[PDB]
Amino acid sequence: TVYTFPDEFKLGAATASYQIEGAWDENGKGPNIWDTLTHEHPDYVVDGATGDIADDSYHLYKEDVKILKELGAQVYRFSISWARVLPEGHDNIVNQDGIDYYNNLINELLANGIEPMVTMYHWDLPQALQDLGGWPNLVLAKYSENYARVLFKNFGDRVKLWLTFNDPLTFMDGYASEIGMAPSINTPGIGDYLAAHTVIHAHARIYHLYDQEFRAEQGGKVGISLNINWCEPATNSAEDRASCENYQQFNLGLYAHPIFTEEGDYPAVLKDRVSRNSADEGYTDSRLPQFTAEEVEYIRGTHDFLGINFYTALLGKSGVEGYEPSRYRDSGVILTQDAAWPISASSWLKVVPWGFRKELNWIKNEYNNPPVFITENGFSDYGGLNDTGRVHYYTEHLKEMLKAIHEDGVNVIGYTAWSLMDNFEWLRGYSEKFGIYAVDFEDPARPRIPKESAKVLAEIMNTRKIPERFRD
Ligand SMILES: OC[C@H]1O[C@@H](OCCN2CCN(CCCN3c4ccccc4C=Cc4ccccc43)CC2)[C@H](O)[C@@H](O)[C@@H]1O
Ligand SMILES: C1=Cc2ccccc2Nc2ccccc21
Ligand SMILES: [Cl-]
Ligand SMILES: [Cl-]
Ligand code: NA
């Protein structure tokens, strides 16, 4: 039983637009902040790589569907490129080519028995909106509503699973470093919090829009995908446990407390630590923006499920470190990783499968067991088809998730592996491989070929259980 997926549980794979599509300026698509980063700052990216072509999924989407069908995916999670649909960011111009592309992909999926799950925003802000300041500028919340209206109107007759945002915890960091994630702006501890505030407002507007203009007719579900690492106390002390709770609240709670709790608002520890630090540093005003009571009420409850992106764990101990100002410093935890944990091709990603179970329990207890869809989980190597590390990563994480479901009563409702194929890995370019299908980026045809992990995942999806040879 503990090794069998619940009957209604949905299994599949995931991608993101800038990581796979290419066709960056084709057929009316406008420029986004990743076009800007990779074109103007190739020194920020391994090998000076760009997403100009990537997997060429703009042209090769039928090949993506073919491999999803081979895999036996029930659901395909992909994102829509805002600037492909609204090249100016604002909703004055709708690019028919973009509408046609996503309709073509959606229709191809449905014709092959695969359910689309659509992420509205996976990091590729139109440059015209970044030029207003991007996410720190609250005017983007209304622009995001207008973008979502276009998506619901055009695609919502066939798409019933939506994520507003993918991982704002990471993309807010684009406002916390001059050399980091797009748009690579150095306002740590100030502009990143403003970005979060706008994103939360935007999410809430999109959810209310769906309620008001679309839900009765379309009958779908709207969530948000949040990334979170497990944070294990470095020692069993109360003080180290406190630091791990700080981590959860500063990383997951930042977004989930306003939306998924009955109280709403930011977590108290976030408000209080930033208020105190801001006062101590001489600011008249806290660096953390505030919600009014009306806004707290508007934002809370804006969810039909919680998307979780889970990759790894950290150790947390009591203390403070980091630059002043920064969210890491504000969070009041000292973070490390255990040298004993298996490594990957990514410095940040260690293999800690039991952390996944711990995290799912933390979520269950904090948010009253919301339906959880695992929207990303995966592993990096530098290449190769005999990807035993990736196979072990998946089988262990799926086992731990299944224990969370069956032994712990966590309401996990689906899982999409990250990623369907090797793709443009942001600042890491093509140097880190997260796919279950390999892609030859030196071959203009970009063939997708299955790794051992794709074969094992196909076996899991077909049999609906963990094969015996991978059990404890
Ligand atoms: O990357 C795979 C997938 O990630 C996913 O983000 C979700 C996963 N992202 C979240 C953002 N994350 C940043 C991690 C910070 N990182 C460092 C920060 C600053 C300096 C140096 C560092 C080096 C090592 C570190 C060690 C310990 C902690 C943090 C470290 C990369 C993984 C994403 O949604 C997919 O699009 C993507 O393909
Ligand atoms: C991020 C900020 C830090 C600031 C100050 C002390 C320790 C830090 N932790 C880090 C270790 C390695 C890379 C980046 C880090
Ligand atoms: Cl201990
Ligand atoms: Cl066997
Ligand atoms: Na339209």
PDB file of all heavy atoms in Angstrom, residues 394-420:
ATOM      1  N   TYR A 394      14.753  10.155  -7.880  1.00  0.00           N
ATOM      2  CA  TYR A 394      13.312  10.067  -8.075  1.00  0.00           C
ATOM      3  C   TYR A 394      12.696   8.964  -7.231  1.00  0.00           C
ATOM      4  O   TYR A 394      11.653   9.173  -6.601  1.00  0.00           O
ATOM      5  CB  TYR A 394      12.957   9.842  -9.546  1.00  0.00           C
ATOM      6  CG  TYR A 394      12.967  11.134 -10.305  1.00  0.00           C
ATOM      7  CD1 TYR A 394      13.872  11.368 -11.333  1.00  0.00           C
ATOM      8  CD2 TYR A 394      12.099  12.150  -9.938  1.00  0.00           C
ATOM      9  CE1 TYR A 394      13.881  12.594 -12.001  1.00  0.00           C
ATOM     10  CE2 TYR A 394      12.090  13.367 -10.592  1.00  0.00           C
ATOM     11  CZ  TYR A 394      12.979  13.588 -11.623  1.00  0.00           C
ATOM     12  OH  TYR A 394      13.012  14.803 -12.261  1.00  0.00           O
ATOM     13  N   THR A 395      13.293   7.776  -7.244  1.00  0.00           N
ATOM     14  CA  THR A 395      12.667   6.669  -6.524  1.00  0.00           C
ATOM     15  C   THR A 395      12.634   6.954  -5.023  1.00  0.00           C
ATOM     16  O   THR A 395      11.624   6.704  -4.365  1.00  0.00           O
ATOM     17  CB  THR A 395      13.310   5.316  -6.861  1.00  0.00           C
ATOM     18  OG1 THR A 395      14.716   5.366  -6.583  1.00  0.00           O
ATOM     19  CG2 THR A 395      13.063   4.936  -8.327  1.00  0.00           C
ATOM     20  N   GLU A 396      13.696   7.549  -4.482  1.00  0.00           N
ATOM     21  CA  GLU A 396      13.670   7.886  -3.059  1.00  0.00           C
ATOM     22  C   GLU A 396      12.672   9.001  -2.735  1.00  0.00           C
ATOM     23  O   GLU A 396      11.936   8.916  -1.747  1.00  0.00           O
ATOM     24  CB  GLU A 396      15.060   8.275  -2.544  1.00  0.00           C
ATOM     25  CG  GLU A 396      16.039   7.115  -2.524  1.00  0.00           C
ATOM     26  CD  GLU A 396      15.570   5.994  -1.605  1.00  0.00           C
ATOM     27  OE1 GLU A 396      15.303   6.260  -0.418  1.00  0.00           O
ATOM     28  OE2 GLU A 396      15.470   4.837  -2.050  1.00  0.00           O
ATOM     29  N   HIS A 397      12.643  10.065  -3.538  1.00  0.00           N
ATOM     30  CA  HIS A 397      11.702  11.144  -3.260  1.00  0.00           C
ATOM     31  C   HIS A 397      10.256  10.700  -3.393  1.00  0.00           C
ATOM     32  O   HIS A 397       9.421  11.077  -2.576  1.00  0.00           O
ATOM     33  CB  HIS A 397      11.979  12.395  -4.088  1.00  0.00           C
ATOM     34  CG  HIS A 397      13.140  13.180  -3.570  1.00  0.00           C
ATOM     35  ND1 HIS A 397      14.450  12.805  -3.777  1.00  0.00           N
ATOM     36  CD2 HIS A 397      13.181  14.292  -2.800  1.00  0.00           C
ATOM     37  CE1 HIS A 397      15.244  13.663  -3.158  1.00  0.00           C
ATOM     38  NE2 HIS A 397      14.500  14.569  -2.547  1.00  0.00           N
ATOM     39  N   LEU A 398       9.960   9.870  -4.392  1.00  0.00           N
ATOM     40  CA  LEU A 398       8.608   9.326  -4.540  1.00  0.00           C
ATOM     41  C   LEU A 398       8.251   8.418  -3.369  1.00  0.00           C
ATOM     42  O   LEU A 398       7.133   8.474  -2.870  1.00  0.00           O
ATOM     43  CB  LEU A 398       8.442   8.634  -5.891  1.00  0.00           C
ATOM     44  CG  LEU A 398       8.442   9.613  -7.071  1.00  0.00           C
ATOM     45  CD1 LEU A 398       8.601   8.838  -8.384  1.00  0.00           C
ATOM     46  CD2 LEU A 398       7.192  10.506  -7.110  1.00  0.00           C
ATOM     47  N   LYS A 399       9.183   7.591  -2.906  1.00  0.00           N
ATOM     48  CA  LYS A 399       8.927   6.782  -1.709  1.00  0.00           C
ATOM     49  C   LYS A 399       8.601   7.641  -0.492  1.00  0.00           C
ATOM     50  O   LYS A 399       7.664   7.342   0.265  1.00  0.00           O
ATOM     51  CB  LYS A 399      10.092   5.837  -1.396  1.00  0.00           C
ATOM     52  CG  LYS A 399      10.199   4.695  -2.400  1.00  0.00           C
ATOM     53  CD  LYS A 399      11.221   3.651  -1.989  1.00  0.00           C
ATOM     54  CE  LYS A 399      12.615   4.176  -1.852  1.00  0.00           C
ATOM     55  NZ  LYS A 399      13.496   3.103  -1.295  1.00  0.00           N
ATOM     56  N   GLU A 400       9.353   8.722  -0.316  1.00  0.00           N
ATOM     57  CA  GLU A 400       9.135   9.587   0.835  1.00  0.00           C
ATOM     58  C   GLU A 400       7.796  10.308   0.740  1.00  0.00           C
ATOM     59  O   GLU A 400       7.070  10.434   1.733  1.00  0.00           O
ATOM     60  CB  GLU A 400      10.285  10.582   0.981  1.00  0.00           C
ATOM     61  CG  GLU A 400      11.609   9.924   1.359  1.00  0.00           C
ATOM     62  CD  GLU A 400      11.604   9.308   2.751  1.00  0.00           C
ATOM     63  OE1 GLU A 400      10.952   9.862   3.660  1.00  0.00           O
ATOM     64  OE2 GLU A 400      12.247   8.249   2.927  1.00  0.00           O
ATOM     65  N   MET A 401       7.449  10.754  -0.464  1.00  0.00           N
ATOM     66  CA  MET A 401       6.151  11.371  -0.694  1.00  0.00           C
ATOM     67  C   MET A 401       5.018  10.384  -0.410  1.00  0.00           C
ATOM     68  O   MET A 401       3.999  10.734   0.180  1.00  0.00           O
ATOM     69  CB  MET A 401       6.082  11.873  -2.130  1.00  0.00           C
ATOM     70  CG  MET A 401       4.796  12.598  -2.479  1.00  0.00           C
ATOM     71  SD  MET A 401       4.695  12.967  -4.247  1.00  0.00           S
ATOM     72  CE  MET A 401       4.383  11.335  -4.915  1.00  0.00           C
ATOM     73  N   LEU A 402       5.184   9.140  -0.851  1.00  0.00           N
ATOM     74  CA  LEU A 402       4.160   8.137  -0.621  1.00  0.00           C
ATOM     75  C   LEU A 402       4.001   7.824   0.869  1.00  0.00           C
ATOM     76  O   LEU A 402       2.887   7.569   1.333  1.00  0.00           O
ATOM     77  CB  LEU A 402       4.442   6.876  -1.435  1.00  0.00           C
ATOM     78  CG  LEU A 402       4.149   7.010  -2.929  1.00  0.00           C
ATOM     79  CD1 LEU A 402       4.762   5.841  -3.681  1.00  0.00           C
ATOM     80  CD2 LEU A 402       2.645   7.075  -3.191  1.00  0.00           C
ATOM     81  N   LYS A 403       5.089   7.861   1.635  1.00  0.00           N
ATOM     82  CA  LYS A 403       4.963   7.728   3.090  1.00  0.00           C
ATOM     83  C   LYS A 403       4.198   8.918   3.665  1.00  0.00           C
ATOM     84  O   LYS A 403       3.348   8.740   4.539  1.00  0.00           O
ATOM     85  CB  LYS A 403       6.325   7.540   3.772  1.00  0.00           C
ATOM     86  CG  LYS A 403       6.965   6.184   3.435  1.00  0.00           C
ATOM     87  CD  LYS A 403       8.235   5.886   4.209  1.00  0.00           C
ATOM     88  CE  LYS A 403       9.354   6.794   3.766  1.00  0.00           C
ATOM     89  NZ  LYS A 403      10.697   6.377   4.264  1.00  0.00           N
ATOM     90  N   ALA A 404       4.488  10.126   3.184  1.00  0.00           N
ATOM     91  CA  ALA A 404       3.747  11.302   3.636  1.00  0.00           C
ATOM     92  C   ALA A 404       2.249  11.126   3.372  1.00  0.00           C
ATOM     93  O   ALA A 404       1.416  11.469   4.224  1.00  0.00           O
ATOM     94  CB  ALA A 404       4.279  12.557   2.965  1.00  0.00           C
ATOM     95  N   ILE A 405       1.896  10.593   2.202  1.00  0.00           N
ATOM     96  CA  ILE A 405       0.486  10.389   1.860  1.00  0.00           C
ATOM     97  C   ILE A 405      -0.115   9.303   2.743  1.00  0.00           C
ATOM     98  O   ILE A 405      -1.118   9.534   3.424  1.00  0.00           O
ATOM     99  CB  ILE A 405       0.326  10.019   0.365  1.00  0.00           C
ATOM    100  CG1 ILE A 405       0.715  11.193  -0.534  1.00  0.00           C
ATOM    101  CG2 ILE A 405      -1.119   9.583   0.051  1.00  0.00           C
ATOM    102  CD1 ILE A 405       0.936  10.796  -1.985  1.00  0.00           C
ATOM    103  N   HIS A 406       0.492   8.121   2.731  1.00  0.00           N
ATOM    104  CA  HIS A 406      -0.165   6.954   3.313  1.00  0.00           C
ATOM    105  C   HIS A 406       0.004   6.850   4.822  1.00  0.00           C
ATOM    106  O   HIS A 406      -0.943   6.479   5.528  1.00  0.00           O
ATOM    107  CB  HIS A 406       0.345   5.674   2.647  1.00  0.00           C
ATOM    108  CG  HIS A 406      -0.090   5.530   1.224  1.00  0.00           C
ATOM    109  ND1 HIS A 406      -1.417   5.441   0.861  1.00  0.00           N
ATOM    110  CD2 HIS A 406       0.622   5.462   0.077  1.00  0.00           C
ATOM    111  CE1 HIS A 406      -1.505   5.321  -0.451  1.00  0.00           C
ATOM    112  NE2 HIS A 406      -0.282   5.319  -0.950  1.00  0.00           N
ATOM    113  N   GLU A 407       1.210   7.132   5.310  1.00  0.00           N
ATOM    114  CA  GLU A 407       1.495   7.052   6.739  1.00  0.00           C
ATOM    115  C   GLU A 407       1.139   8.322   7.503  1.00  0.00           C
ATOM    116  O   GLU A 407       0.744   8.264   8.670  1.00  0.00           O
ATOM    117  CB  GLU A 407       2.965   6.692   6.996  1.00  0.00           C
ATOM    118  CG  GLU A 407       3.358   5.356   6.371  1.00  0.00           C
ATOM    119  CD  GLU A 407       4.730   4.849   6.777  1.00  0.00           C
ATOM    120  OE1 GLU A 407       5.386   5.470   7.642  1.00  0.00           O
ATOM    121  OE2 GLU A 407       5.131   3.799   6.226  1.00  0.00           O
ATOM    122  N   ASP A 408       1.289   9.475   6.853  1.00  0.00           N
ATOM    123  CA  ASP A 408       1.157  10.746   7.563  1.00  0.00           C
ATOM    124  C   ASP A 408      -0.121  11.509   7.216  1.00  0.00           C
ATOM    125  O   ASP A 408      -0.386  12.554   7.796  1.00  0.00           O
ATOM    126  CB  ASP A 408       2.378  11.654   7.324  1.00  0.00           C
ATOM    127  CG  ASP A 408       3.709  10.984   7.643  1.00  0.00           C
ATOM    128  OD1 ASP A 408       3.761  10.020   8.433  1.00  0.00           O
ATOM    129  OD2 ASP A 408       4.727  11.442   7.073  1.00  0.00           O
ATOM    130  N   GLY A 409      -0.886  11.028   6.240  1.00  0.00           N
ATOM    131  CA  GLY A 409      -2.150  11.674   5.884  1.00  0.00           C
ATOM    132  C   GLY A 409      -2.022  13.014   5.180  1.00  0.00           C
ATOM    133  O   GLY A 409      -2.953  13.817   5.219  1.00  0.00           O
ATOM    134  N   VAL A 410      -0.911  13.248   4.490  1.00  0.00           N
ATOM    135  CA  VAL A 410      -0.743  14.509   3.777  1.00  0.00           C
ATOM    136  C   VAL A 410      -1.502  14.431   2.455  1.00  0.00           C
ATOM    137  O   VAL A 410      -1.372  13.453   1.710  1.00  0.00           O
ATOM    138  CB  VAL A 410       0.739  14.828   3.490  1.00  0.00           C
ATOM    139  CG1 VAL A 410       0.846  16.149   2.763  1.00  0.00           C
ATOM    140  CG2 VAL A 410       1.537  14.888   4.787  1.00  0.00           C
ATOM    141  N   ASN A 411      -2.304  15.455   2.160  1.00  0.00           N
ATOM    142  CA  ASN A 411      -3.126  15.433   0.945  1.00  0.00           C
ATOM    143  C   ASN A 411      -2.360  15.859  -0.310  1.00  0.00           C
ATOM    144  O   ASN A 411      -2.615  16.923  -0.882  1.00  0.00           O
ATOM    145  CB  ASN A 411      -4.384  16.300   1.084  1.00  0.00           C
ATOM    146  CG  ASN A 411      -5.375  16.094  -0.076  1.00  0.00           C
ATOM    147  OD1 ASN A 411      -5.364  15.063  -0.765  1.00  0.00           O
ATOM    148  ND2 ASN A 411      -6.228  17.080  -0.299  1.00  0.00           N
ATOM    149  N   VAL A 412      -1.399  15.044  -0.723  1.00  0.00           N
ATOM    150  CA  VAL A 412      -0.693  15.285  -1.971  1.00  0.00           C
ATOM    151  C   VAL A 412      -1.540  14.713  -3.119  1.00  0.00           C
ATOM    152  O   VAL A 412      -1.925  13.533  -3.090  1.00  0.00           O
ATOM    153  CB  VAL A 412       0.721  14.666  -1.965  1.00  0.00           C
ATOM    154  CG1 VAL A 412       1.494  15.165  -3.184  1.00  0.00           C
ATOM    155  CG2 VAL A 412       1.460  14.977  -0.665  1.00  0.00           C
ATOM    156  N   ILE A 413      -1.795  15.538  -4.134  1.00  0.00           N
ATOM    157  CA  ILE A 413      -2.729  15.203  -5.213  1.00  0.00           C
ATOM    158  C   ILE A 413      -2.072  15.006  -6.579  1.00  0.00           C
ATOM    159  O   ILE A 413      -2.707  14.516  -7.512  1.00  0.00           O
ATOM    160  CB  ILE A 413      -3.852  16.270  -5.345  1.00  0.00           C
ATOM    161  CG1 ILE A 413      -3.304  17.669  -5.693  1.00  0.00           C
ATOM    162  CG2 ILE A 413      -4.699  16.286  -4.068  1.00  0.00           C
ATOM    163  CD1 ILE A 413      -4.348  18.686  -6.171  1.00  0.00           C
ATOM    164  N   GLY A 414      -0.807  15.387  -6.722  1.00  0.00           N
ATOM    165  CA  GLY A 414      -0.140  15.172  -8.004  1.00  0.00           C
ATOM    166  C   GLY A 414       1.335  15.479  -7.903  1.00  0.00           C
ATOM    167  O   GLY A 414       1.799  16.001  -6.888  1.00  0.00           O
ATOM    168  N   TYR A 415       2.058  15.144  -8.968  1.00  0.00           N
ATOM    169  CA  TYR A 415       3.507  15.266  -9.006  1.00  0.00           C
ATOM    170  C   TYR A 415       3.952  15.392 -10.462  1.00  0.00           C
ATOM    171  O   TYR A 415       3.668  14.498 -11.268  1.00  0.00           O
ATOM    172  CB  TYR A 415       4.157  14.036  -8.358  1.00  0.00           C
ATOM    173  CG  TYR A 415       5.667  13.958  -8.388  1.00  0.00           C
ATOM    174  CD1 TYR A 415       6.418  14.281  -7.256  1.00  0.00           C
ATOM    175  CD2 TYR A 415       6.343  13.512  -9.521  1.00  0.00           C
ATOM    176  CE1 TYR A 415       7.801  14.180  -7.273  1.00  0.00           C
ATOM    177  CE2 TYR A 415       7.716  13.395  -9.538  1.00  0.00           C
ATOM    178  CZ  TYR A 415       8.434  13.749  -8.426  1.00  0.00           C
ATOM    179  OH  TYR A 415       9.785  13.580  -8.500  1.00  0.00           O
ATOM    180  N   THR A 416       4.650  16.482 -10.783  1.00  0.00           N
ATOM    181  CA  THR A 416       5.314  16.617 -12.076  1.00  0.00           C
ATOM    182  C   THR A 416       6.829  16.709 -11.888  1.00  0.00           C
ATOM    183  O   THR A 416       7.327  17.636 -11.250  1.00  0.00           O
ATOM    184  CB  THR A 416       4.779  17.809 -12.901  1.00  0.00           C
ATOM    185  OG1 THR A 416       4.812  19.010 -12.116  1.00  0.00           O
ATOM    186  CG2 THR A 416       3.355  17.567 -13.352  1.00  0.00           C
ATOM    187  N   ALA A 417       7.558  15.745 -12.449  1.00  0.00           N
ATOM    188  CA  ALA A 417       9.019  15.729 -12.408  1.00  0.00           C
ATOM    189  C   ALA A 417       9.583  16.949 -13.118  1.00  0.00           C
ATOM    190  O   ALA A 417       9.152  17.316 -14.213  1.00  0.00           O
ATOM    191  CB  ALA A 417       9.548  14.450 -13.072  1.00  0.00           C
ATOM    192  N   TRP A 418      10.584  17.559 -12.489  1.00  0.00           N
ATOM    193  CA  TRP A 418      11.387  18.589 -13.143  1.00  0.00           C
ATOM    194  C   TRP A 418      12.691  17.963 -13.635  1.00  0.00           C
ATOM    195  O   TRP A 418      13.486  17.518 -12.791  1.00  0.00           O
ATOM    196  CB  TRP A 418      11.745  19.731 -12.177  1.00  0.00           C
ATOM    197  CG  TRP A 418      12.459  20.805 -12.939  1.00  0.00           C
ATOM    198  CD1 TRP A 418      13.806  20.984 -13.072  1.00  0.00           C
ATOM    199  CD2 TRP A 418      11.835  21.791 -13.763  1.00  0.00           C
ATOM    200  NE1 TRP A 418      14.061  22.039 -13.923  1.00  0.00           N
ATOM    201  CE2 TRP A 418      12.865  22.561 -14.346  1.00  0.00           C
ATOM    202  CE3 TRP A 418      10.497  22.110 -14.042  1.00  0.00           C
ATOM    203  CZ2 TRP A 418      12.604  23.628 -15.203  1.00  0.00           C
ATOM    204  CZ3 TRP A 418      10.235  23.202 -14.867  1.00  0.00           C
ATOM    205  CH2 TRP A 418      11.289  23.934 -15.448  1.00  0.00           C
ATOM    206  N   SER A 419      12.986  17.918 -14.941  1.00  0.00           N
ATOM    207  CA  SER A 419      12.209  18.481 -16.042  1.00  0.00           C
ATOM    208  C   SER A 419      12.001  17.409 -17.108  1.00  0.00           C
ATOM    209  O   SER A 419      12.768  16.442 -17.186  1.00  0.00           O
ATOM    210  CB  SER A 419      12.978  19.651 -16.668  1.00  0.00           C
ATOM    211  OG  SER A 419      12.237  20.236 -17.727  1.00  0.00           O
ATOM    212  N   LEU A 420      11.002  17.607 -17.956  1.00  0.00           N
ATOM    213  CA  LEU A 420      10.822  16.726 -19.098  1.00  0.00           C
ATOM    214  C   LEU A 420      12.119  16.542 -19.885  1.00  0.00           C
ATOM    215  O   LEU A 420      12.473  15.416 -20.266  1.00  0.00           O
ATOM    216  CB  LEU A 420       9.728  17.279 -20.004  1.00  0.00           C
ATOM    217  CG  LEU A 420       9.452  16.444 -21.265  1.00  0.00           C
ATOM    218  CD1 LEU A 420       8.972  15.020 -20.935  1.00  0.00           C
ATOM    219  CD2 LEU A 420       8.453  17.188 -22.157  1.00  0.00           C
TER     220      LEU A 420
END
